[PDB]
Amino acid sequence: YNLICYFTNWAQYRPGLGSFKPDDINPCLCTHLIYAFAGMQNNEITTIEWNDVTLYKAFNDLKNRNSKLKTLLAIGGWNFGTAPFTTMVSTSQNRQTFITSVIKFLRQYGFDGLDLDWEYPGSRGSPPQDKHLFTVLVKEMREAFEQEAIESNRPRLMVTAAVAGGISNIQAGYEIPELSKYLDFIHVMTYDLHGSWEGYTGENSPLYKYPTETGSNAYLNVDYVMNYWKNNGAPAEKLIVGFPEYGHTFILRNPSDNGIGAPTSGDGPAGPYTRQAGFWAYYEICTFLRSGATEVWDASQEVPYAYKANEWLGYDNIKSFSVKAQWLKQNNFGGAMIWAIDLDDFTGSFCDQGKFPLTSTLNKALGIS
Ligand SMILES: CC(=O)N[C@@H]1[C@@H](O)[C@H](O[C@@H]2O[C@H](CO)[C@@H](O)[C@H](O)[C@H]2NC(C)=O)[C@@H](CO)O[C@H]1O
Ligand SMILES: CC(=O)N[C@@H]1[C@@H](O)[C@H](O[C@@H]2O[C@H](CO)[C@@H](O)[C@H](O)[C@H]2NC(C)=O)[C@@H](CO)O[C@H]1O
Ligand SMILES: [Mg+2]
Incomplete structure (x- = not known):
């Protein structure tokens, strides 16, 4: 079993004992850590906090304490909305540009994969064609990751997605059979x-x-x-x-x-x-x-x-x-x-x-350690 743990880059600003940064993570609890969130500019992945580069390093340095751990970077989230995703998936050119930026960004900063957190294709202003174009994006990203692994002789980058739990959003958003072939994990x-x-x-x-x-x-x-x-x-x-x-x-x-x-x-x-x-x-x-x-x-x-x-x-x-x-x-x-x-x-x-x-509790129940 896997135990996937999200970390948020705004927890640092909570007062007193609530302030939380990557060095507060016990690296042996989870099998995967996911960093929430990256943003997007000009159809390329980007940081959103002034000190994301610092926190990225502390986050991926956790793999120095747990050799089995994988890290992913999540893009999007609730407040991100849908507009940048809609524009990015609308053409093959914009998708190739995004995918190319992701490979470079993840490798440079030490991440093992990308978590797509679009909330949601086909909803919140996203037009109906985005249901199918989300599948196309994921298929193209998976294919590009497969090839980069061969070219760089490194384990392939993962592509995962956080997906809706509301049925209306699920029906409007996802081609589940095809999407599920190309995603590595589906975070419901x-x-x-x-x-x-x-x-x-x-x-x-x-x-x-x-x-x-x-x-x-x-x-x-x-x-x-x-x-x-x-x-x-x-x-x-x-x-x-x-x-x-x-x-x-x-x-x-x-x-x-x-x-x-x-x-x-x-x-x-x-x-x-x-x-x-x-x-x-x-x-x-x-x-x-x-x-x-x-x-x-x-x-x-x-x-x-x-x-x-x-x-x-x-x-x-x-x-x-x-x-x-x-x-x-x-x-x-x-x-x-x-x-x-x-x-x-x-x-x-x-x-x-x-x-x-x-x-x-989940570490113990799922036999992680
Ligand atoms: C993987 C996931 O659950 N993603 C979504 C998160 O964005 C959302 O958390 C909320 O994120 C906002 C930024 O998008 C923050 O401003 C806000 O504090 C935070 N809200 C809560 C309740 O944690 C989570 C919450 O379940 O769910 C998804 O919608
Ligand atoms: C099953 C379902 O679709 N539930 C919806 C809720 O997610 C949603 O609440 C909002 O969820 C976001 C994560 O997806 C959070 O970031 C956000 O804080 C939260 N809104 C709150 C706590 O007020 C509600 C209301 O928008 O709609 C439900 O349908
Ligand atoms: Mg009563």
Whole structure:
């Protein structure tokens, strides 16, 4: 099994104990580390932070402590949008220019591959032709990587992609049978399945549907999403299950109505380190649990939730990570990916569960070390 761990280049700016840079990573936890994010300019891959070159070096220097580790650079992300991707894939010339820039950039800075994080082909302004042109881009990139390996006598660069977990986005975005032939791994974003945007409480990454859900609400679970990818053409061994090391928060409209599906208002509370309404890192969750919160096991969905007065949290813990890890092995998936290692209790100072408790749980369950 593989354990793919995302690192984010803005975690460095969090205050105090939240500040996280590549030297905070334990290099033996994961099989692959992915650096989020690179950008694009003039159809070529580029940096986005003033000190990315420094952080790239610290990141790829982690391979000096773990000889089996591979690193990848992710391009895109949510806030990147779709416009640069649409322009880049629109012509063979623009695609060859991008691919050429990627080979040079990855080799120069010491990366072993590229993770495509276009959110999403065919959605968010991307026109319908981008579904097929994404396949063309990946096929051409895979072919170019194969040839560069022969020419340079080095192991081939990997091409992977982070892909939608929402069914409407999947249907608009991906030619799954053909795309799956050329990708090395498919990182399915089986999280953000519920959140304050819905107006009621729900779990960030429930394994199974809630018993009362019918129709399109029943898409919103790990089991459905992973099996959608598998049964529409993706090989199980290339499919990587997304594991969030964070939870989504809500403000309850009536604190006495605090179950799954209880009505909510607004964007949800923010945490002192991540400072974004609706989102708490696992280490911030541990502080909440120590602040008088009630913890509940959502038995049908195999995940926890917790509440305190008007605040409600849907999240993941060691138990739910363990259940889902057993599940993915039983379904013959390729492994797990975590968003994001800088949201784990990397200092060990918040959760009393050791350093990197969630990532360590997957390391152990998947036999990585
Ligand atoms: C591989 C992956 O999950 N990519 C997406 C991420 O971009 C997104 O994280 C968000 O990234 C923004 C930049 O694109 C950051 O500004 C923001 O802080 C961060 N949000 C959260 C909730 O972490 C993750 C989140 O699951 O999912 C994808 O959408
Ligand atoms: C299954 C699905 O498609 N869920 C969607 C959510 O992803 C989305 O939330 C946003 O997800 C981004 C990663 O893809 C994050 O970067 C972003 O922070 C997050 N928005 C939040 C937390 O408010 C929601 C709302 O846009 O839509 C769902 O359909
Ligand atoms: Mg009640």
